Amino acid sequence: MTEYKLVVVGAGGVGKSALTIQLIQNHFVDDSYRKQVVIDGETCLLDILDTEGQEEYSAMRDQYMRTGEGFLCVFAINNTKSFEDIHQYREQIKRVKDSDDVPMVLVGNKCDLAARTVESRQAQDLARSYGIPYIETSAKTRQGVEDAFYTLVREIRQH
Ligand SMILES: Nc1nc2c(ncn2[C@@H]2O[C@H](COP(=O)(O)OP(=O)(O)NP(=O)(O)O)[C@@H](O)[C@H]2O)c(=O)[nH]1
Ligand SMILES: [Mg+2]
């Protein structure tokens, strides 16, 4: 069966681990993660690398990242700086993979929260300028969680 190596990147505290744990174990929180799912009738194995938001420079984090086939770029909708940093993570991904066209999905997490600081429209405009999908998610309520990982799989299938 096909294996997709997905990797979740973004600034610290945006919910990368929470999104991974909700998808894999189905509980909001507050190792290595693998799961066998069915996406558009196709049974497949998702292997998720959950990453740290800062790490100076490590050729081993670079090498581990380079193994990924698709990337969730996560910011948090009540963290304006996390949204401003998205560009840096896309640059790192491009660099690590030597490609300007890596399967990618922009993810605005914590959409259960009120008093957001980043409007949907800013992220949509950014994603549509990158030509990648934009999904809003909540690891608490689970809205969007499977949407973002499965959409990223679809970005890989259709690459
Ligand atoms: N309300 C709410 N809180 C969330 C959501 N996702 C994560 N959080 C909270 O935000 C905090 C950070 O989550 P975490 O998953 O650790 O983020 P991270 O990006 O993995 N952090 P790190 O980069 O340091 O590993 C936790 O308290 C977590 O419960 C969400 O969708 N909604
Ligand atoms: Mg984490």
GROMACS .gro file of C-alpha atoms and ligand atoms in nm:
model
  192
    1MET     CA    1   0.000   0.000   0.000
    2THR     CA    2   0.113   0.357  -0.066
    3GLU     CA    3   0.290   0.545   0.212
    4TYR     CA    4   0.277   0.926   0.227
    5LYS     CA    5   0.533   1.093   0.451
    6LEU     CA    6   0.371   1.414   0.573
    7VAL     CA    7   0.551   1.663   0.791
    8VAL     CA    8   0.402   1.942   1.000
    9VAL     CA    9   0.598   2.265   1.031
   10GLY     CA   10   0.539   2.609   1.177
   11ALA     CA   11   0.616   2.848   1.460
   12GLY     CA   12   0.617   2.736   1.821
   13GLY     CA   13   0.284   2.683   1.994
   14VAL     CA   14   0.068   2.688   1.680
   15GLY     CA   15  -0.058   2.334   1.750
   16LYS     CA   16   0.157   2.108   1.527
   17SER     CA   17   0.171   1.828   1.786
   18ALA     CA   18  -0.195   1.880   1.879
   19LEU     CA   19  -0.305   1.841   1.516
   20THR     CA   20  -0.092   1.530   1.476
   21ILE     CA   21  -0.224   1.374   1.796
   22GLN     CA   22  -0.587   1.452   1.713
   23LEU     CA   23  -0.550   1.290   1.371
   24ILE     CA   24  -0.364   0.983   1.499
   25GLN     CA   25  -0.522   0.922   1.840
   26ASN     CA   26  -0.850   1.125   1.827
   27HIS     CA   27  -0.811   1.320   2.147
   28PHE     CA   28  -0.731   1.684   2.209
   29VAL     CA   29  -0.446   1.722   2.454
   30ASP     CA   30  -0.407   2.058   2.636
   31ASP     CA   31   0.736   0.952   1.911
   32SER     CA   32   0.653   0.850   1.555
   33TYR     CA   33   0.295   0.864   1.431
   34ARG     CA   34   0.149   0.633   1.169
   35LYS     CA   35  -0.206   0.546   1.068
   36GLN     CA   36  -0.381   0.344   0.798
   37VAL     CA   37  -0.666   0.538   0.640
   38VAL     CA   38  -0.893   0.540   0.336
   39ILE     CA   39  -0.882   0.854   0.120
   40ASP     CA   40  -1.119   0.858  -0.179
   41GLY     CA   41  -1.148   0.480  -0.151
   42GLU     CA   42  -0.771   0.427  -0.152
   43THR     CA   43  -0.626   0.252   0.153
   44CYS     CA   44  -0.289   0.400   0.244
   45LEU     CA   45  -0.049   0.466   0.529
   46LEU     CA   46   0.010   0.814   0.667
   47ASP     CA   47   0.344   0.868   0.837
   48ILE     CA   48   0.359   1.201   1.019
   49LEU     CA   49   0.679   1.381   1.123
   50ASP     CA   50   0.593   1.633   1.396
   51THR     CA   51   0.867   1.898   1.408
   52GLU     CA   52   0.991   2.166   1.646
   53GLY     CA   53   0.928   2.529   1.556
   54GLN     CA   54   1.291   2.641   1.596
   55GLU     CA   55   1.610   2.439   1.574
   56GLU     CA   56   1.904   2.668   1.483
   57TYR     CA   57   2.052   2.467   1.197
   58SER     CA   58   2.078   2.088   1.196
   59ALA     CA   59   2.169   1.889   0.887
   60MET     CA   60   1.986   1.598   1.051
   61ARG     CA   61   1.660   1.790   1.093
   62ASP     CA   62   1.716   1.894   0.731
   63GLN     CA   63   1.773   1.531   0.628
   64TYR     CA   64   1.472   1.408   0.823
   65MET     CA   65   1.257   1.685   0.672
   66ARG     CA   66   1.379   1.605   0.317
   67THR     CA   67   1.219   1.259   0.352
   68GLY     CA   68   0.873   1.417   0.363
   69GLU     CA   69   0.653   1.418   0.055
   70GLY     CA   70   0.408   1.686   0.167
   71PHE     CA   71   0.407   1.963   0.424
   72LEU     CA   72   0.147   2.129   0.643
   73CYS     CA   73   0.258   2.487   0.707
   74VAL     CA   74   0.073   2.571   1.030
   75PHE     CA   75   0.013   2.909   1.183
   76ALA     CA   76  -0.233   2.990   1.464
   77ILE     CA   77  -0.515   3.233   1.388
   78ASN     CA   78  -0.460   3.420   1.714
   79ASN     CA   79  -0.083   3.445   1.666
   80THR     CA   80  -0.004   3.716   1.414
   81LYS     CA   81   0.373   3.651   1.423
   82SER     CA   82   0.319   3.281   1.349
   83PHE     CA   83   0.137   3.391   1.031
   84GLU     CA   84   0.418   3.632   0.936
   85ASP     CA   85   0.671   3.349   0.973
   86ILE     CA   86   0.496   3.120   0.724
   87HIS     CA   87   0.718   3.259   0.448
   88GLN     CA   88   1.029   3.140   0.633
   89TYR     CA   89   0.893   2.787   0.661
   90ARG     CA   90   0.808   2.774   0.291
   91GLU     CA   91   1.163   2.892   0.215
   92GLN     CA   92   1.308   2.620   0.438
   93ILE     CA   93   1.092   2.358   0.268
   94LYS     CA   94   1.193   2.476  -0.079
   95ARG     CA   95   1.558   2.472   0.031
   96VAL     CA   96   1.551   2.131   0.199
   97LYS     CA   97   1.371   1.969  -0.097
   98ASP     CA   98   1.549   2.161  -0.378
   99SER     CA   99   1.210   2.236  -0.533
  100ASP     CA  100   0.984   2.538  -0.567
  101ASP     CA  101   0.683   2.306  -0.617
  102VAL     CA  102   0.654   2.087  -0.307
  103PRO     CA  103   0.305   1.955  -0.219
  104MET     CA  104   0.195   2.192   0.056
  105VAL     CA  105  -0.116   2.304   0.244
  106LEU     CA  106  -0.144   2.625   0.446
  107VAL     CA  107  -0.313   2.557   0.782
  108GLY     CA  108  -0.465   2.814   1.013
  109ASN     CA  109  -0.510   2.625   1.341
  110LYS     CA  110  -0.713   2.697   1.658
  111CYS     CA  111  -1.021   2.806   1.464
  112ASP     CA  112  -1.238   2.723   1.767
  113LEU     CA  113  -1.101   3.036   1.929
  114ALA     CA  114  -1.271   3.373   1.933
  115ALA     CA  115  -1.075   3.697   1.909
  116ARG     CA  116  -0.860   3.576   1.622
  117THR     CA  117  -0.589   3.812   1.502
  118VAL     CA  118  -0.535   3.677   1.147
  119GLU     CA  119  -0.840   3.703   0.922
  120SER     CA  120  -0.923   3.417   0.685
  121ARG     CA  121  -0.882   3.654   0.390
  122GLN     CA  122  -0.514   3.724   0.456
  123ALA     CA  123  -0.429   3.354   0.461
  124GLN     CA  124  -0.647   3.273   0.158
  125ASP     CA  125  -0.475   3.548  -0.045
  126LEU     CA  126  -0.133   3.416   0.058
  127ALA     CA  127  -0.220   3.053  -0.019
  128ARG     CA  128  -0.383   3.145  -0.352
  129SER     CA  129  -0.068   3.340  -0.444
  130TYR     CA  130   0.140   3.030  -0.361
  131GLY     CA  131  -0.114   2.819  -0.547
  132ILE     CA  132  -0.173   2.591  -0.247
  133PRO     CA  133  -0.488   2.506  -0.052
  134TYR     CA  134  -0.584   2.681   0.271
  135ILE     CA  135  -0.765   2.488   0.548
  136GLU     CA  136  -0.876   2.617   0.885
  137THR     CA  137  -0.852   2.358   1.161
  138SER     CA  138  -0.919   2.294   1.526
  139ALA     CA  139  -0.731   2.021   1.711
  140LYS     CA  140  -0.973   2.081   2.000
  141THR     CA  141  -1.302   2.033   1.816
  142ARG     CA  142  -1.143   1.827   1.531
  143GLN     CA  143  -1.291   2.056   1.262
  144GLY     CA  144  -1.063   2.066   0.961
  145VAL     CA  145  -0.810   1.817   1.100
  146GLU     CA  146  -0.869   1.526   0.865
  147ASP     CA  147  -0.948   1.783   0.590
  148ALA     CA  148  -0.594   1.926   0.604
  149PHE     CA  149  -0.402   1.598   0.612
  150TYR     CA  150  -0.614   1.432   0.341
  151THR     CA  151  -0.605   1.741   0.122
  152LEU     CA  152  -0.225   1.733   0.155
  153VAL     CA  153  -0.230   1.367   0.042
  154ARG     CA  154  -0.436   1.479  -0.256
  155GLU     CA  155  -0.181   1.751  -0.333
  156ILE     CA  156   0.080   1.471  -0.349
  157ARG     CA  157  -0.131   1.232  -0.562
  158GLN     CA  158  -0.200   1.512  -0.811
  159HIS     CA  159   0.149   1.663  -0.811
  160LIG     N1  160  -0.797   2.616   2.178
  160LIG     C1  161  -0.701   2.548   2.112
  160LIG     N2  162  -0.583   2.527   2.168
  160LIG     C2  163  -0.500   2.459   2.084
  160LIG     C3  164  -0.523   2.412   1.957
  160LIG     N3  165  -0.412   2.346   1.905
  160LIG     C4  166  -0.324   2.355   2.001
  160LIG     N4  167  -0.370   2.422   2.112
  160LIG     C5  168  -0.297   2.446   2.235
  160LIG     O1  169  -0.183   2.523   2.207
  160LIG     C6  170  -0.072   2.477   2.287
  160LIG     C7  171   0.039   2.438   2.190
  160LIG     O2  172   0.008   2.315   2.120
  160LIG     P1  173   0.122   2.227   2.054
  160LIG     O3  174   0.054   2.118   1.983
  160LIG     O4  175   0.213   2.185   2.161
  160LIG     O5  176   0.193   2.321   1.955
  160LIG     P2  177   0.327   2.294   1.883
  160LIG     O6  178   0.326   2.380   1.763
  160LIG     O7  179   0.328   2.146   1.863
  160LIG     N5  180   0.444   2.345   1.979
  160LIG     P3  181   0.602   2.319   1.967
  160LIG     O8  182   0.654   2.394   1.846
  160LIG     O9  183   0.669   2.390   2.082
  160LIG    O10  184   0.619   2.168   1.964
  160LIG     C8  185  -0.130   2.366   2.375
  160LIG    O11  186  -0.184   2.418   2.497
  160LIG     C9  187  -0.246   2.315   2.292
  160LIG    O12  188  -0.346   2.252   2.368
  160LIG    C10  189  -0.650   2.433   1.899
  160LIG    O13  190  -0.689   2.399   1.785
  160LIG     N6  191  -0.734   2.504   1.985
  161MG      MG  192   0.494   2.017   1.905
   0.00000   0.00000   0.00000
